[PDB]
């Protein structure tokens, strides 16, 4: 067994991290006080769920998790929440005043002050690990902390843990879900600074989550709780293979091996189905063919884009519930003859498939209904570059007038870092075009 | 540290600008004092001379 440490930075990373660990405890039968009746080895073990939980002599299962926010109000709702007893004080880290939606303030001004503390508290978790695999980092692209401090931390994690893998779950900004006007700046700045320190990054576009919440849960104006509980379902689908018995994506290195042939093109598209309203009394249970077909519907993707106008490098299908290989291959054969599914020429046209028989867990009283089967598709397609092009375009509009730039220079950042960052994203966009388009 | 030093340079320019404001404030009020006193002295001398 090899351990994974989760790190949650800024408001989005913390509040999403709250939802995930709530879900993880439900999936594993761990009560809010940290007790786990199913676990018969008291105070130790190297089961699969021990990758994410350590154990005390008292029998308490403790998340290998750190929560970090440069303001105390969000983390305080963990301290005093439903799982207070799960975490211990050392894992919740709050500063005094936040980064004010400003990457440069989160990265340079406040980050300097707090990085050594955060690294020290992570070291206390790494020391309890007999074989640390690396880190899962949850954060927004857009926040001052989520963008500015995350990038400083990722740089320092590559220093202090050079051999360890680092995975990201990144919340990509969408005006429908309250955004700062400078979020394009923050997004580009932090992608540039984090690009070479992350081995695999799952972008989640708030616009996509928001619309799924409106369309499939028929919530008229979804809350952060609605958004985060759906996001946590997808995150849990992605991390299940680390926490349960299985042979696919069983450690962080396999994510890179299976999803990322080229280190810079390391942003897989996630597509999830089905998402069913819980106040919908009687709903037909979707079949393997249907939920697999729904994986090629842009309306189910975590980032809206058109994979038909791009090329695939890698594709993993992650099923939960009543699913057998026979049905998967039937559904795939059908889909190959009707969908437009082009792989690059230097890659096998195929699917790695993982099945966990336990159907998804939902939060009692949440807006998602139990289903008897679901699937998360992870595909590395060049079509996700549409998300970069969109963001890059908004950055250009504002930067052409140097709008807001003075806030960043006033924190000690050189204007040249904007151009550095933007030029990196320009290369990134052209790497995608080289890989996935022909003239 | 280079960004920290740039913040420090900018604060120091700022406090230096505000220091120039404080000395201008000092010059204005000592100018008013000087002119009130010169009015009083002028009037006192003209009166003495005419008497
Ligand atoms: N999906 C989701 N997005 C969130 C949540 N909270 C904030 N966001 C999004 O995150 C971005 C804003 O960054 P935040 O994480 O709130 O800000 P922060 O990291 O705390 O940084 P500062 O407050 O500036 O110090 C915006 O795009 C928000 O829409 C959340 O709980 N769930
Ligand atoms: Ca145990
Ligand atoms: Mg905040
Ligand atoms: Mg171990």
What size, in residues, is chain B?
51
Pocket test for ligand 1, best of A8, A11, A177 (most atoms within 8 A of CB): A11
Q: Which residue, judged by its Cα, is nearest atom 14 of ligand 1?
A: A143
Nearest 5°: the CA angle A8, A169, A261 is: 140
How far is Cα A387 from Cα B12, in angstroms, rounded to an integer?
A: 42
Q: Are residues A70 and A114 in the same domain?
A: yes
Annotated binding site of A for GTP: 10-12, 15, 71, 99, 140, 143-146, 179, 183, 206, 224, 228, 252
Mutate to test the interface with A, among B7, B8, B14 (most CBs of A within 10 A): B7
Query: Does ligand 1 lie within 6 Å of residue A321's CB atom?
Result: no
Q: Are A389 and A429 in contact (CB under 8 A)?
A: yes
Q: Are residues A220 and A314 in the same domain?
A: no
Query: Does ligand 1 lie within 6 Å of residue A225's CB atom?
Result: no
Q: Are residues A170 and A258 in the same domain?
A: yes
* SS3 annotation, chain A: CCCEEEEEEHHHHHHHHHHHHHHHHHHCCCCCCCECCCCCCCCCCCCHHHHCEEECCCCEEEECEEEEECCCCCCHHHHCCCCHHHCCHHHEEECCCCCCCCHHHHHHHHHHHHHHHHHHHHHHHHCCCCCCCEEEEEEECCCHHHHHHHHHHHHHHHHHCCCCEEEEEEEECECCECCCCCHHHHHHHHHHHHHHHCCEEEEEEHHHHHHHHHHCCCCCCCCHHHHHHHHHHHHHHHHHHHHCCCCCCCCHHHHHHHHCCCCCCCCCEEEEECCCECCCCCCCCCCHHHHHHHHHCHHHECCCCCHHHCCEEEEEEEEEECCCHHHHHHHHHHHHHHCCCCECCCCCCCCEEEEECCCCCCCCCCCECCCCEEEEEEEEEHHHHHHHHHHHHHHHHHHCCCCCHHHHHCCCCCCHHHHHHHHHHHHHHHHHHHHHCCC
Q: Are residues A338 and A227 in the same domain?
A: no
Q: Are residues A29 and A118 in the same domain?
A: yes
Q: Are residues A49 and A195 in the same domain?
A: yes
Q: Are residues A137 and A264 in the same domain?
A: yes
User: How would you class A245 by CB atoms within 10 Å of its CB: exposed for 0-12, middle for 13-18, buried for 19 or more?
Assistant: exposed
How far is Cα A3 from Cα A49, in angstroms, rounded to an integer?
A: 9
Q: Are residues A322 and A431 in the same domain?
A: no
Query: Does ligand 1 lie within 6 Å of residue A142's CB atom?
Result: yes
Q: How many domains does chain A have?
A: 3
Flag if B5 and A410 touch (Cβ within 8 Å). no
How far is Cα A345 from Cα A347, in angstroms, rounded to an integer?
A: 6
Protein residues near ligand 4, an ion, with CB under 5 A: A 1, 130-131
Domain encompassing residue A309: 269-383
Q: Tell me the two tokens of residue A332.
A: 């795939």
Tell which residue, A64, A58, A62, A68, has the closest CA to residue A83.
Answer: A62
**CA-based nearest residue in chain A for residue B2:** A412
Question: CA end-to-end span of chain A, whole Å?
Answer: 48
Mutate to test the interface with B, among A116, A412, A413 (most CBs of B within 10 A): A412
Rounded to the nearest whole angstrom, what is the distance from the C-alpha of residue A147 to the centroid of ligand 1? 10
Instruction: Give the resolution in Å.
Output: 2.3
**What are residue A138's DSSP bridge partners?**
A8, A169
Q: Are residues A63 and A157 in the same domain?
A: yes
Q: Are residues A209 and A306 in the same domain?
A: no
Q: Tell me the two tokens of residue A318.
A: 């992650």
Which CATH number does the domain housing residue A125 bear? 3.40.50.1440
Q: Tell me the two tokens of residue A399.
A: 């930067």
Return the ligand 1 atom nearest residue A144 CA: 24
Residue A114: how many other CB atoms lie within 10 Å: 20
Q: Are residues A58 and A110 in the same domain?
A: yes
Q: Are strands A61-63 and A53-55 parallel, antiparallel or unpaired?
A: antiparallel
Flag if B7 and A112 touch (Cβ within 8 Å). no
Task: Spell A302-316 as b/e; 16+ CB within 10 A means b.
Answer: bbbbebeebbbbbbb
Which CATH number does the domain housing residue A356 bear? 3.30.1330.20
**What are residue A166's DSSP bridge partners?**
A135
Query: Could you say which ligand is closest to the alpha carbon of residue A140?
Result: 1
How far from A15 is each of A106, A122, A138, A297, CA to CA, in Å?
18, 19, 10, 28
How far from A34 is each of A23, A76, A217, A379, CA to CA, in Å?
13, 19, 31, 35
Q: Of A237, A268, A299, which residue sits at a domain end?
A: A268
Q: Are residues A237 and A323 in the same domain?
A: no
Q: Is the backbone of residue A393 left (phi > 0), alpha (psi -120 to 50) or beta?
A: alpha
Return the ligand 1 atom nearest residue A231 CA: 1
Q: Are A49 and A55 in contact (CB under 8 A)?
A: no
Q: If DSSP codes are grouped into helix, strand and coil, which group holds residue B1? A: coil
């Amino acid at each position: 067994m090899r351990e994974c440490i989760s790190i949650h930075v800024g408001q989005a990373g913390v509040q999403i991290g709250n939802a995930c660990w709530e879900l993880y405890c439900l999936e594993h039968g761990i009560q809010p006080d940290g007790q786990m009746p199913s676990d018969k080895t008291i105070g130790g073990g190297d089961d699969s769920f021990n990758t994410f939980f350590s154990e005390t002599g008292a029998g308490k299962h403790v998340p290998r998790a750190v929560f970090v926010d440069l303001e105390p109000t969000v983390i305080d709702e963990v301290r005093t929440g439903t799982y207070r007893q799960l975490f211990h004080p050392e894992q919740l880290i709050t500063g005094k005043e936040d980064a004010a939606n400003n990457y440069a303030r989160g990265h340079y001004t406040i980050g300097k002050e707090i990085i050594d503390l955060v690294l020290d508290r992570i070291r206390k978790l790494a020391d309890q690990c007999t074989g640390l695999q690396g880190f899962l980092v949850f954060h927004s692209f857009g926040g001052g902390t989520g963008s500015g401090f995350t990038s400083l931390l990722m740089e320092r994690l590559s220093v202090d843990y050079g051999k360890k893998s680092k995975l990201e779950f990144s919340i990509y900004p969408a005006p429908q879900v309250s955004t700062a006007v400078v979020e394009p700046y923050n997004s580009i700045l932090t992608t540039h600074t984090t690009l070479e320190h992350s081995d695999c990054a799952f972008m989640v576009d708030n616009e996509a989550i928001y619309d799924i919440c409106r369309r499939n849960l028929d919530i008229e104006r979804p809350t952060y709780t609605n958004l985060n509980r759906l996001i946590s379902q997808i995150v849990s689908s992605i991390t299940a293979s680390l926490r349960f018995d299985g042979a696919l994506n069983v450690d962080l290195t396999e994510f890179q091996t299976n999803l990322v042939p080229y280190p810079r093109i390391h942003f897989p598209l996630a597509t999830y189905a089905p998402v069913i309203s819980a106040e919908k009394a009687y709903h037909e249970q979707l079949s393997v063919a249907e939920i697999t077909n729904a994986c090629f519907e842009p309306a189910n993707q975590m980032v809206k884009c058109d994979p038909r106008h791009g090329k695939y490098m890698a594709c993993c299908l992650l099923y939960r519930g009543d699913v057998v290989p026979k049905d998967v291959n039937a559904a795939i054969a059908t889909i190959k003859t009707k969908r437009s599914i082009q792989f690059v020429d230097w890659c096998p046209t195929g699917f790695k498939v993982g099945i966990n028989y336990q159907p998804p867990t939902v939060v009692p009283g949440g807006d998602l209904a139990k289903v008897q089967r679901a699937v998360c598709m992870l595909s590395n397609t060049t079509a996700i570059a549409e998300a970069w092009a969109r963001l890059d375009h908004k950055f250009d509009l504002m930067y052409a007038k140097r709008a807001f730039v003075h806030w960043y220079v006033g924190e000690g950042m050189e204007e040249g870092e904007f151009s550095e960052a933007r030029e990196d994203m320009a290369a990134l966009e052209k790497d995608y075009e080289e890989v996935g388009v022909d003239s | 540290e280079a960004a920290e030093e740039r913040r420090k340079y900018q604060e120091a320019e700022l406090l230096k600008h505000l220091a120039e404001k404080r000395e201008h404030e000092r010059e204005v009020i000592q100018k008013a004092i000087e002119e009130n006193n010169n009015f009083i002295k002028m009037a006192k001398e003209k009166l003495a001379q005419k008497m």
